[PDB]
Design an enzyme around this catalytic site. Sequence first.
Site, mmCIF file in Angstrom:
data_model
loop_
_atom_site.group_PDB
_atom_site.id
_atom_site.type_symbol
_atom_site.label_atom_id
_atom_site.label_comp_id
_atom_site.label_asym_id
_atom_site.label_seq_id
_atom_site.Cartn_x
_atom_site.Cartn_y
_atom_site.Cartn_z
ATOM 1 N N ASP A 451 1.005 -0.864 0.269
ATOM 2 C CA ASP A 451 0.163 -0.180 0.160
ATOM 3 C C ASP A 451 1.108 1.201 -0.354
ATOM 4 O OD1 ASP A 451 -3.166 0.645 -0.190
ATOM 5 O OD2 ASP A 451 -2.696 1.491 1.687
ATOM 6 N N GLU A 483 -0.968 -0.096 -5.347
ATOM 7 C CA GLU A 483 -1.837 0.772 -5.487
ATOM 8 C C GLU A 483 -1.834 1.420 -6.876
ATOM 9 O OE1 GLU A 483 -1.870 2.990 -1.517
ATOM 10 O OE2 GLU A 483 -4.131 4.574 -2.837
#
Length: 1100
Positions: A451, A483
Site C-alpha cells: 500500500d 496501489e
Amino acid sequence: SHMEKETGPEVDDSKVTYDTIQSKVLKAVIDQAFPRVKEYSLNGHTLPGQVQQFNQVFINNHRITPEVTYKKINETTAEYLMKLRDDAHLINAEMTVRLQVVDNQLHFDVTKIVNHNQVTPGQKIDDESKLLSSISFLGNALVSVSSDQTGAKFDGATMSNNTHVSGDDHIDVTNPMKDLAKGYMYGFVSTDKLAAGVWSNSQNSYGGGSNDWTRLTAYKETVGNANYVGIHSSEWQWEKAYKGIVFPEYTKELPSAKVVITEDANADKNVDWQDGAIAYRSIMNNPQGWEKVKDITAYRIAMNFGSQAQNPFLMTLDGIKKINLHTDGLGQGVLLKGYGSEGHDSGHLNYADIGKRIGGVEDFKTLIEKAKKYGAHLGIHVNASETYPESKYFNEKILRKNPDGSYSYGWNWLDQGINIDAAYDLAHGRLARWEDLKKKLGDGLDFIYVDVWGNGQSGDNGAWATHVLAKEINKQGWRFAIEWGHGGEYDSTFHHWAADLTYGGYTNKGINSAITRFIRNHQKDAWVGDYRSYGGAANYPLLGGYSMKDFEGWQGRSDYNGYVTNLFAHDVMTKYFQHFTVSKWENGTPVTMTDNGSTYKWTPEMRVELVDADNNKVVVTRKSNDVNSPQYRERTVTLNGRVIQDGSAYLTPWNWDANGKKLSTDKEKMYYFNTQAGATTWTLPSDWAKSKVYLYKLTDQGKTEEQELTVKDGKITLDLLANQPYVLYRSKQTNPEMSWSEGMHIYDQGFNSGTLKHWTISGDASKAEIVKSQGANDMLRIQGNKEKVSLTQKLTGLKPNTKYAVYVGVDNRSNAKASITVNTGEKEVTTYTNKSLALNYVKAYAHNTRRNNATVDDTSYFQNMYAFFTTGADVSNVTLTLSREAGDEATYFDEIRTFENNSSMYGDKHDTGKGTFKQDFENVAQGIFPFVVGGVEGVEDNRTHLSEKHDPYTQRGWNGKKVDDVIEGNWSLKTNGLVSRRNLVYQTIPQNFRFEAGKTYRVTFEYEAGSDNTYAFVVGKGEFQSQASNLEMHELPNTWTDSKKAKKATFLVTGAETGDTWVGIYSTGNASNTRGDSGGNANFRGYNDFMMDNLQIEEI
Ligand SMILES: [Ca+2]
Ligand SMILES: [Ca+2]
Ligand SMILES: [Ca+2]
Ligand SMILES: [Ca+2]
Ligand SMILES: [Mn+2]
C-alpha cells in the site's frame, strides 16, 4: 520538408577495426575498440547501431575514456575489458562488457565489475565518490534508423494514467524533424523491412509521471545529411549508499540490455512497431508471477480492522467456496487487508505478525493450502512507508523526520502513525522482515500488495527503490502488487487503482498506452478498463480491463450479488483475452469526445487480434467507429472465425481449470452471459455439434436447472435471463460436496449450503428457515413458534482439555429468549439475549446496520453472542445448540465461530458462569467485549480498538505523550480522537453482560483521559437514541495533570426491571484541551483520547 534540412558531422570510420559476431540469422558488425554495434544485418536487410563513434562512458556522471581491450570469444560472442581510471574523481575500476548474438537478439551485458576502492555493502563509507554508483552508455545507440531509409519511424511508450492522453509517440524519422532527447519505457525503430525493439534493466528515472520508468532514452542525431533516431539504454545503477551506509549487496544488479531484430511477425505484410513488440517478448523482463494473472478472474479484498476479526482466515475459505460454486471453478485472488496484528492499519512493518484474533499462522496456513483446489490465491496488504508505536519495528532511527527535525507524521485513526524513511529501512535490515514472514508462513502465499508506496510518504519510491523492494518480495517467491496505476511498472502484476475502476477519476487509472498494453496485456491487470464516464481509452476498450468489486467489508462493501454479476459482465472476457498474446492492433479514425470538462480528440482501437502457442487466433472488432453510435461500445469476438461474443452477449469457451490447467476435452465448458433479454444463436465447434449439450443456471448453490439443449446444424439458440451466468457442457454434471466451514468445528457456519441437514432440530422445523438479509446474506431465522425451537450440532475436531470461545451473530427482534448453549459432555454453558438493543456500527462487518446489508426493516442489531467453555478428555460428544423460546417475531442467527481462547472473566475462571466479572483485555476473543462499538461515528472503521503495549513508545512520555496506550498488561481498550461528538462511543449489551432486574452492581475500571470531561461514563437502558434517550452521565477528569498513571473510576448501577440496563462511554459536547499543541503533536499526545483497562463488575 518546409523547415531547413539539417546537417551534422560526417562519419569517418576508415581507421576502425570491425569484427563480426553472428548467429545463423543475425550479423552484427562491432568496433573492436569499444562495444559499439555499427550495423545489424538480417535476411539481407539492415539497421544501423551507433554510426558516429562516441568512445566514452559516464561513470558517476563523469565523462571517462575507457582503456579497452577486445577478445573474440566465439562466432557469436565478443568481450571488452574496459578500464576506468580518473584519479581526480576517485574512479579506479574496470568492467567487462559482453556482446552476444543469440538467434535474432543482441545482448549487451556488463558481466563483471571491479571497484578498486574499498567498498563494503552494509558498512559505512566515508566518501560516496569512492562508490561506483552509476554506469551510463548514453551516447551509444544500441540500434537506430536513418531518415535515408524507406519507412523510417520511431515508436515509444511513456507512462500516462489519464484516459484522454495516450502515453505513446509515433514519430517518422525525417530530415528535417523535431528535436528528440527523451526517456521511454518501450522503444522501437523500423524501416519497411525490419523492426527492432530494445530492452534494458536500467532503473533510471528522469522524474515523476511520463519521465519515470525511463529505462531507454531515444535521441535524434544528425549525421551528415541524415537524421538518425537511436535508442540508448538509460543510465544503470550499481553501488549506492544512504547517509553514508552502503546498501546491501542484493541491491546491485548487473547492467543488461537487449535488442531484437525482426521481419513481419504478424503476417500483415507491413513492418512496424507491432512486429517489434511481438519480438520484444523474447528479450523483455517478465514480472514474476505473471503466468498466474490470466486465471485470477475473481479478485476481491477480505478486511479485518480494529481488533474485530470480521473475517477470520477460515471464514474466507467459505467465501472462496461460494465463488467457486457460483462461477463453476473460476480462479480467485483474495487480498487479505488486515491479515496482520489487530487488522488493517495496525502493526505495520511487522510482516510476520499474523493476526491472532483471526486465527493466527495456523489458520492462515490452512486457508492457503485448502484454497489451492479452488484455484484461489491469497495475497496480503503490507505497508513499507508508515508505522505505529505498537509495532515491534517502531524505533526513533527508522522514523522519517522533516528538515526542521519534526516528525513526518502519518495519518491519525486508531493510532497516530509516523512515516518511515524507506532508504534508511532498506539500509538497515528491511529484507529480514520479509524473510521472517516467509519462514513462519512457508510456501504457498501468492502476492504481496504494498500500500501507498509510490506516493513519497517514505521518501524515494521511484523506479530504482521500487525494483529493490519488489526483488525482496519476489525473492520470497511472492508476486508484486501496488496501489497506483503509475507504480511498479517493471515488477507489478496488479494495480489497485487500475483494477477498481471507480477510484481516482479519469486522470488516475491504468497505463494508457497501446504499445505497452499490446506487449504486456496478458501479464498484469494494469490497464484502462471500461468506464464510460472517463472517456478516451476507457470508453469501451476492446480488451476490456479488470473491474474489481468486493463483498467482504472493504470500504463497507458487502454486495455479493453485484460482485458476481460484475465478474461475468467484465472480467470473464478480460481474462479470456489474457490467455492469448496481442498480435495486431488497428486504430480507426479519430473521434471527438466531451467529458470531464473538455472536448478532445481520441483515436480508438477498432480491431485487436491475439494468438496463442497453438495458433488459435482471436479477433476483437469494435462494431462502429461512430462515437455517437451504440455500436461504438460493442464488439464482435471470433475464435478461429467462430463468433463467441457479439454485442450484449457471449458464449465463450473456457478450457482451463481454476488454476489455469488445460481441461480434458470432456471437461471443456462454455459460459453464457447476456446483459439484455433476447434469444441468441451460436455456432458450436464440430466436436460439440454432434454431442448432447446440457445447460446449467449458475447460482450460489452451483449448477442448477439442468436443461438438455436442442442442437441444429451445429447451432444452439439461447433465450435466457439477462445478467445471469450459465455454463454449458457436453455431458451431465453434478455439484460436489463443499465441506463448508472445514476446520471451524461446525458445518456451514454462515448458512451457505442451502439446507439445515447437519442440524438436529428439536421442535417445529417449519419455524426455522434459511432466509436472505437485505444484503442477500443467508441467515437462520426462527419465528412464529408457539413452542421452543432448538437446533443442535456436534462441534467436531476439538482438542481435548482445551479452552474455547464460541459466538454466533444474533439479531433478535423478539422479546423471546434466543440462546447459544454448549454441552461439553461434562458441563453445559448457555448465554442468551431477549430483544436486541444495539445497532451494529462495524463497517468491515457483513451485518452492520447500513441499509443495503440490513437484516430486515432497514436495520441490523447483529452482535456476537458468546459462550466460553473447556473440553474434557473426550471430545466426541460436544454439542452446540441454538434455540428460541416461543414468540411471534423473528430471531436471526449467522456465523457460528468456535476458536481457542484463554480469557478468565468469570470469577477468575474461563467458563461462562457466575462470579465477579473481570475484563483485563489480555485475552479478548474479538472486538471490545463486553462492550460493542456505538454509533458515535455511524457505521465506520471504528476508532476504538484494543491497544497493544510497546514500551516506551506507546506509553506516557514518548514524544511528550500525556497518557498510556496501555494501562496494565499488554492490552487496553483505546478510543482515539472522538471528542466533542455528543454520542455513545460503546456500551455493554445484556447478552455480553446482564445487569439483572433489581440487582445492584459496582462497576469499576481504570482509565486514562487526555482532557477534562471530554468522555463520560454513562448508564442507560434499552436502545440508545442520540428524543434523546435518558442517560445517567459521569464526566471523567483528565488523568495526567495531577496523576502519574491511570485513575480509578467506580459507580453503583442497579439493573432496570426490564433487564435492559447497560453501561458505556459517551463522547460529551465538551471541547478538549490540547495545551497549546496542534496538528500531529496534539493527535499523538493523547489530549483527545480515552483508554480503559481492568474492568470489574460485581454484585453488591
Ligand atoms: Ca516540411
Ligand atoms: Ca507486421
Ligand atoms: Ca450468512
Ligand atoms: Ca490490560
Ligand atoms: Mn493500536
